[PDB]
């Protein structure tokens, strides 16, 4: 329904396992696109496509690019946290409008 916080581990390539991202036009937010089967976030289970990503490691992201986000995440060394709003909507339309077209995203 709300917010939270999931603090996950790299993988042996640098990877949580998530692709941030959003369309194109105006939006205030960055949103979880797409989980990965195989992937540390996808174990843990808490976060799904569809969500909102708002914060790393105790720092929000309003303002920031799907790239700047990814670069903040992709240069943490070790363990990273993850602050999101879980939606309310059916999470499968959720993952639905999020399968495109045009859905830029970086994969993390």
Request: aromatic content about 4%; hydrophobic content about 35%.
């Amino acid at each position: 329904g709300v917010p939270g916080k999931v603090t996950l581990q790299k993988d042996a390539q640098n990877l949580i396992g998530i692709s941030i991202g959003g369309g194109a036009q105006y939006c205030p937010g960055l949103y979880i696109v797409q989980v990965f089967d195989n992937t540390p976030a996808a174990l843990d289970g808490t976060v799904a496509a569809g969500d909102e990503i708002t914060g790393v490691n105790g720092r929000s992201i309003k303002g920031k690019t799907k790239v700047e986000v990814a670069k903040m995440i992709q240069e943490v060394k070790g363990e990273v946290t993850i602050h999101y709003n879980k939606l309310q909507a059916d999470p499968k339309q959720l993952e639905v409008l999020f399968n495109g077209p045009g859905i830029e995203s970086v994969k993390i």
